[PDB]
Design a protein around this ligand. Sequence first.
Ligand SMILES: Nc1ncnc2c1ncn2[C@@H]1O[C@H](COP(=O)(O)OP(=O)(O)OP(=O)(O)O)[C@@H](O)[C@H]1O
Ligand SMILES: Nc1ncnc2c1ncn2[C@@H]1O[C@H](COP(=O)(O)OP(=O)(O)OP(=O)(O)O)[C@@H](O)[C@H]1O
Ligand SMILES: Nc1ncnc2c1ncn2[C@@H]1O[C@H](COP(=O)(O)OP(=O)(O)OP(=O)(O)O)[C@@H](O)[C@H]1O
Ligand SMILES: [Mg+2]
Ligand SMILES: [Mg+2]
Ligand SMILES: [Mg+2]
Lengths: 151, 257, 257, 257, 257
Amino acid sequence: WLFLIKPYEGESLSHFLGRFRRANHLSASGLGTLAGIGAIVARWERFHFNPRPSQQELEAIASVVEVDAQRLAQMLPPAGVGMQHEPIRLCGACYAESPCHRIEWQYKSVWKCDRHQLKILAKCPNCQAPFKMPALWEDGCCHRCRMPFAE
Amino acid sequence: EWLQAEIARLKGKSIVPLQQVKTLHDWLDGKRKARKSCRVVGESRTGKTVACDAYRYRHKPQQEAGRPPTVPVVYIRPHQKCGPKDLFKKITEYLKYRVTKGTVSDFRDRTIEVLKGCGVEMLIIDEADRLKPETFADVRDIAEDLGIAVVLVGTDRLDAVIKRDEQVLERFRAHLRFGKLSGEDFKNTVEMWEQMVLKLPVSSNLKSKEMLRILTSATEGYIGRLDEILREAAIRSLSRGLKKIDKAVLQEVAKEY
Amino acid sequence: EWLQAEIARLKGKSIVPLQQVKTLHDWLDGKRKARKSCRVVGESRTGKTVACDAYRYRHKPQQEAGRPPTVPVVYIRPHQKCGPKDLFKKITEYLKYRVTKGTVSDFRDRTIEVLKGCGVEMLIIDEADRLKPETFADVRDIAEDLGIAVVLVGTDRLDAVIKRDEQVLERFRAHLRFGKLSGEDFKNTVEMWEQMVLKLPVSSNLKSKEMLRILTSATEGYIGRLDEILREAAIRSLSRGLKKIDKAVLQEVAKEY
Amino acid sequence: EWLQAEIARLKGKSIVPLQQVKTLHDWLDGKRKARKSCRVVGESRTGKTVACDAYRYRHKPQQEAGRPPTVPVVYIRPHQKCGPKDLFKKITEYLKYRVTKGTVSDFRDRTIEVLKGCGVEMLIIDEADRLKPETFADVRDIAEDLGIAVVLVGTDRLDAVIKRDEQVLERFRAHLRFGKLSGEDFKNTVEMWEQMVLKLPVSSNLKSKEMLRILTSATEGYIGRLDEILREAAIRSLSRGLKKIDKAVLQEVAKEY
Amino acid sequence: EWLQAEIARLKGKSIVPLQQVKTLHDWLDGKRKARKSCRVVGESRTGKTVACDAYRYRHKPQQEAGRPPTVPVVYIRPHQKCGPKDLFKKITEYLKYRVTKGTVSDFRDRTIEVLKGCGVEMLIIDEADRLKPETFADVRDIAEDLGIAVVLVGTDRLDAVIKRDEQVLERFRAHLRFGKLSGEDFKNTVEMWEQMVLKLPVSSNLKSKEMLRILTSATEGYIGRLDEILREAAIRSLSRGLKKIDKAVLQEVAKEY
DNA sequence: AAAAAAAAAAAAAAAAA
DNA sequence: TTTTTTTTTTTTTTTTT
Ligand SMILES: Nc1ncnc2c1ncn2[C@@H]1O[C@H](COP(=O)(O)OP(=O)(O)OP(=O)(O)O)[C@@H](O)[C@H]1O
Ligand SMILES: Nc1ncnc2c1ncn2[C@@H]1O[C@H](COP(=O)(O)OP(=O)(O)OP(=O)(O)O)[C@@H](O)[C@H]1O
Ligand SMILES: Nc1ncnc2c1ncn2[C@@H]1O[C@H](COP(=O)(O)OP(=O)(O)OP(=O)(O)O)[C@@H](O)[C@H]1O
Ligand SMILES: [Mg+2]
Ligand SMILES: [Mg+2]
Ligand SMILES: [Mg+2]
C-alpha cells in the first residue's frame, strides 16, 4: 500500500511513479520491480512507462494499491503526440522549483520552457553526460559527475 | 448436544484477572511514559504471555482519522534463530503494511518509516532469547534513535544470553521478576477459577482442604498447571455424565503428572 | 496541563557540560590540526557518543560562497555487518548528496569527489567494531590518500577486532581512554544535574549524603545510569503530585536495578 | 528510631589506627621503592587483611590527566583453586578494563598491556594459599619481566605451600611477621576501642582491671575477637535499654566462646 | 601568520634518503635489466610504499619520440577484492588512456596494446594480498607473454595468499625482505630527520641519550612511528610558542601510544 | 531483467587426563 | 574441568548472461 503523492495535472507518468517511490521510501527501479511482483501480470516494465496492456495494469493499481486513488491513466500518453524516442530533455528551473517533470518535455516542438523561457537541456554542461530525469531522478543531479545540472 | 457444547467451550482459553497481571500492567505503564528500557523475566507457565496479550488489549489502536492507525503498543514473538530480515518483516506486518521484495538495508528504512507516523510508544519482544546475537544491534538502534521503550520479555535463560554483550546488558538493567503463586493467593485463585473459568451445573467446592491439598501438590504454584488439571478434570467428569468434578477425578488426573 | 508539559520535557534529552567532554573536545582538536588518525575507547553508558555529537555542533558547516557547504567534520554510525557499499552511501548522504544506482566501483569515486571540495578534515566512525573486516581497507585508503584523520570511536570489544589486522592496528595506535565518574567529580555532577537538568518547583538537595550514597550505589559512576535514575524519579514524583523527589522515590527506583 | 540507628552503625565495620598497621605500611613502602618481592605471614584474626586495605587507600589512584589512571598499587584476593585465566581476569578488572572472550594466551598479553601504562608499582595477593601451583609461574613472570613487587600475603599454611617449589621459595625469602597483641599494647588498644569505635551515651570504663581480665581471657590477644566481643556486647546492651556495657553482659557474651 | 605557515608545512609529507631505500632501488634495477619477477615483503610502517614511489620518480617517463610516452616502470595499488576488470582499468588509466565501455575480453586486449609501444619494463603491484585469487592468472599472462617483470610488493600476510597457488608460488620465489631500524642506524636517522625534515628555529638535539631512549621506546624501530612522534611533537611545541621540542613534549606524546 | 551456487567462516560436542 | 578440530548446514553475496 502506497501513500498518494500531491497530484499535479501536468506531471509526467514517469515523474509520478518516481515521486511515489521517493515518498514511500524506495528507488524508482525498485518500485517498478516491486509493482511487477505485486501484480504478476508478466508484461510490466521497469523503464518503458507507457504500454497498452499496462493501461489495464495502471487502472488496477490506481484502484487497489493506494490509500486514495490517484489519476494515473490521465498522466499516461497512449500513442501520445510527437513523442521523443531519444532521451527526454528537461528544465532545471522546473525540477528545482517544483520537484516534478512536465509531460510537455516528452514532445517535440516544445524546445523552450514556456514558464522560464529558456532552452530545455539534454546534457550536463562540461561533463557532457546526457541527463534524463526519468533515469537520473528529479533532483537534477548528474549521474557521472554528481554536479547539479545547470542551465 | 449440551455435552459437546460444554466440551467445545472447556477446551478453549480465556484471560482471568489476577494480582500479578495488574502489577505488570501498572509497571509497564510507568516505563511507557518514561520511554525507559526494561526487562521482564520469570519461570515457565506462570501468567506472562497472557499478561502481555492482556496489556495490548488494554490500550488498543486508535483510528479516528484518514491517516494510518495510531498504534501505541507493538507485540511480536520472533521465530527460532531470528535474523535481522525476519525481525523487521514481523514488525512491519503487525502494523498492517505489506513487505515488498528487497534486502535488509532498504528494509531498515521502511520499518523506521512505519514505526514513525503511528505512535509506537512501546515494543514488546517476547521470547527474546530466540534471536541471533547480531540482531540485538538493530533492537538497540530502534531503542536509541526513536522515542520507543523495548520490554524484552523472557525466561531465566535470557539472562545468560544478555550477559554475553556489554552494550545490551547495560541498556536493559531494570527488571520485573514475574513469579508463581503460594499461600492464600493460591486458595483465592482456585475460588476465582471455579467461579469464572468453570460453569459446571453443580459446584465442586474446590476451595475445600481435602481437595485443595491435591490441587496444591499437583500444581506447585504454576498457574499453567492449575488450568490444565482443572480444565481436563472438567471435560473428563462431564464425559462420565457427572455435573461436578469428583475428588476421584482430581486424583486420577494428578497421577498422570 | 502543567504536569504533562513537565513530563514531555523530562522524557526528553539534553547535553550537560562535563570535564570529560571538554577533555575529549580539545584532544580531537589536536588530532584534527595534525591530521592524525587515532582511536578513542570507553566503557558502555560513559557518555562517549554524546561527547562526539557535541563536537560536531562546536564545529558547524560554513558557507561563504555559492559552492557546496564547507563541511569541517563528518560523523557517521555504521549499521550491523556494514559492507563497503553501505559505508560510502552513508558518508555521501551525510554531506547532502543523493546516491545514484551503481556499483561500489562507481560511487567509491563519487565519495572521493565529495570528500574533496568540502574541507572534511575529520571523519568520526562511531561503533567501529560493527563493520565487516574487508571495509577497513576502504577506511585506510581514505585516511592514506586524503588529508583526513579518522577517530574510530568504540567500546573495549573494538580492540579485539583491531588486533586481528596488522595494517589497521599499527595505523591506529594513539588512543584516549574515556572513563567513568568517582569521588568529588560525581558529587559535583549530581549538584550540576539538579542545578541544570532538573527544574522542579521545589529543590531535592540530591547532594546531601543520605541520598548521595543511594545515587552512588545505584549509579556506580556511569553517567547513563545517573541520567536514568534521576529522570525516571522526577517523572514518577510529579505523577504523585510531589514538587520534589523524596528519598522513598530514589529507593523505590534503585530497587528496580 | 535512635536505637535502630545505633544498631545499624554498630553492626558495621571501620579501620582503627594501630602500631602493627603503621609498621606494615612503612615496611611495604621500603619494598615498593626497592621493587623487592617479599611475604607477609601471621595468625588468623590478627588484622592482616584490613592493614592491606588501609595501605591501598593511603596511596590512591591519580586521575589528573585524560589518560588511563596510574594505579600505584593493585590488591586482589584469588578465588578457591585459582587457575591462570582467573588470576589475569581479576587483575584486569581491578584496572577497570573489561575482559573479552579468548584464551589464557590472549589476555595474558592484554594483562601485560594493562600492566604497562598503569603504574602498578606493587601487586598484593591476599589468600596466597588459594592458587593452583601452576599459577606461581605466571606470578614469577610478572615479578621478573616488569619491575613490580609482589607481597604474597598468607597465613602460616602458605609456608607449607611455598616450600614445595624451589624457584618460588628463593624469590620470596624476605618476610614480615604480624603477631598478636599482649601486655600494655592490649590495654591501650581497649582504651582506644571504647573511645573511637564505641560511642555509647555513657562510658563503660573497659580499661578497668575487673573487666579487662575478662576481655583478656575472652580475646587471647586477637584483634578480631576484641572486635566481636565488644561490638556484640554493645548491641546486646542497647537492646536492653542500657546506656553502657555492664560487666554481666561481657561475661554473658564471653561464655559463648 | 608565521605559526600557521610552519604548521601547514609540518602536517605535510616528504621523502628522506635512507640506506633501506637505496638498497631496494639497486635491487629492483637488477630485476628490471634481467626482466625477473620478484617479491618485496616486510612489516607495516617500515616505509615499503614510500621507497616504491621514490623509484618511479627516479626513472620518469621519457617522451622524446613520435611514439606514445615511454614509461619504463608502472606503479598501481589495487582496490579491495580487486577483480580482473579493475586491474586492467587501473593499468590503462595510469598510462593515460581512457577506458571505453566493454567487457573484460575487450579491454584485456586494449591493455596489451598500451603495455606494448611504451617500454613498460616493470610493473609494481602494491598491496598484492588484497586481490582476487582469479586475477593472478591475468598477472602471470602479462609476466609470461610480455618482457615485463612484476614486483608484487606486500606485507607478511601476502605469503599466506601466495602459497595457496602452486603456479604463482614458483613464479615469484625471489624476494627482498624489508627490515626495521635498530642500533646506530636509528640514531643516525634521528640526526638526519632533525636536520632535513624539521626546520624549527631552535635545535632540539634529539640525538642526545636522555631523549633518544624515549624516541627508541616510543618508536620500536618503525620509521612510521618516528615520523608521527616527531611531526606531532613539533606542531604541539610551536602551538605553545616554543622554538624547539622540550623533553616534556616528547614524553607527553609518547604516553598516547 | 535475476538467481544460484557455493567458499568459507562459525559453532557446539564429546573425548581424554 | 579445559583443549582441539571438525564437521556441517545456513547464510549473504557476487557476478554474469
Ligand atoms: N491470567 C490468566 N487467566 C487464565 N489463564 C491463564 C492466565 N495466565 C496463564 N493462563 C494459562 O496458562 C496457559 C499459558 O501460559 P503462559 O503462556 O502465560 O505461560 P508463559 O510464562 O508464557 O510460558 P513461557 O514463559 O514458558 O513461554 C494458558 O493455556 C492459560 O490457560
Ligand atoms: N554529556 C551528556 N549529558 C547528558 N546526558 C548524557 C551525556 N552523555 C551521555 N548521557 C546519557 O547517556 C545516554 C546516551 O548514551 P551514552 O552516550 O551515555 O552512551 P555511549 O557513550 O554512546 O556508550 P555506547 O556507545 O556504548 O552506548 C543518554 O540517555 C544520556 O542521558
Ligand atoms: N623514507 C621515508 N620518507 C617518507 N616517509 C617515511 C619514510 N620512512 C617512513 N616514513 C613514514 O612511515 C610510513 C611508511 O610508509 P608506508 O606505511 O606506506 O610503508 P608500508 O609499511 O610498506 O605500508 P603498507 O602498510 O602498505 O605496507 C609513511 O606513512 C611515512 O609517513
Ligand atoms: Mg509464553
Ligand atoms: Mg552511542
Ligand atoms: Mg603502503
